[PDB]
Amino acid sequence: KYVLQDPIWLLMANTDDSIMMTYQLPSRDLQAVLKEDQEKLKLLQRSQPRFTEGQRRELREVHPWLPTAIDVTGCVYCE
């Protein structure tokens, strides 16, 4: 007899029927949650990946010098 356990993502989560069957995400404000990202980013933008001339050039060949795939209002099917 052996019993393995749930993986970490379950153990760390309340997974009873009310969460599984009807938990909802919150409804928020844009400019609130926007600003917080800025602050964390100021922390984060340390590693930030940094390249050099040899590397920095290859992105122009694959990328628009980038907002291309994201410069939109929603995704593309319900907005």
Add this chain to the structure above:
Amino acid sequence: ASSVHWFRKGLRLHDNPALLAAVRGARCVRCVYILDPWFAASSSVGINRWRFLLQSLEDLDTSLRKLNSRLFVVRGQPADVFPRLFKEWGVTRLTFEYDSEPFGKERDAAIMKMAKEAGVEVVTENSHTLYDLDRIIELNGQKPPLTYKRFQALISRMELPKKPAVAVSSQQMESCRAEIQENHDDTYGVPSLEELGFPTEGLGPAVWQGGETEALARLDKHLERKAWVANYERPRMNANSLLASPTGLSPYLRFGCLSCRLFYYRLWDLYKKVKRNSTPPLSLFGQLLWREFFYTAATNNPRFDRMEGNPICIQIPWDRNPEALAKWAEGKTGFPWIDAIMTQLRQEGWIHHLARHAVACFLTRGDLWVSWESGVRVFDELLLDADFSVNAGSWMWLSCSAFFQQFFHCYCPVGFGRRTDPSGDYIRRYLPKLKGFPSRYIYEPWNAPESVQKAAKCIIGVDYPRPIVNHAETSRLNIERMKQIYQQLS
């Protein structure tokens, strides 16, 4: 000369430049897989990958039986068993297939330090990949290609991948039956799922049968007119593509049950014959080249599978929400297109790469803003063809965290299904609480006339999950957060 060939990947007798090495000078040799069934498995949810591994060893054993030998699964750690196995067997040398991935390398090295200081010889062939990955890296200023475009360029300028070795030997190996202890199965037998701690009652035939034998048969089906046309010529996305193909090869490639090179020089040969061209577009080999890319982009990157500490991953303020990650992982997002991909993944162990894209989008950039490195964790236990480099590499791109390729709009949790499979055949298959729903409503059971949910034996919020979020609502906000990370990005 008495040696030992160690299996980890490369679970195959064919194209094994490492198993070949061991046998040439040898008097008598023995193969090994090393496992501590007692602690090997991480969770109750990872049955498919271990079942695949065990059928693989079992096949290896069958094949090695026809050589009057057998496979030796050794319980223990590649650190505690190796020295003992040295003394008990007086092994002159060790052969194993090169593992590129950072942690394997370290482990492999510290096990080289051990064999040298114990005076035992070592050879590694790199037959898990098409190329010697290191050379791709040196050819680029001893740094890894950052884009697929540059990756492609670099390998067109190098040699061609080695031909598949004629690995296997009979009358020159089959009679190396020097020692034959019949206490064998009791001590070196292939573990069962129960030793690993899995319950195997009520357990059907594996959708993805393990072994080299199933792999090679699959290669042949893969390369026949009907499979060729449908996969390599007129590729179209239908509800049928979502289904596990009898010709699918990704899991076999991951375990090494199939040689990526053999696959290579046969996909070439078939092109040469059918198109009458002996120099095929690079994109023909796309599924292999992307696997190579990643094995390359990660080999010198200990943290390839983590956001922070990874030199090529964009750092991003992902949210924590363990309940969200759980609902996703379980297939209870309340969005039938997602929930059914996640359900298939769990039962069967494979999903289509666009089912992957859709599911990776919903969790990261699209709707829940949860860190991709968590998706990688969930797939590491669930997905047959996932591994360190391939699984994380893929997730970085999908979430918009890496620069391997051009980004692309967020698939929709409701729309991208009903385009792909309008019938809803797929959803009814994996979510049978939703059988009696019309395809019209089915991708969105919340905005479907109440009468139906009453007259469909499942009502929303009671028998099936109410929608985690609502798409437009939350997707309207993450896209701006996404632009923000990119606006403020230098």
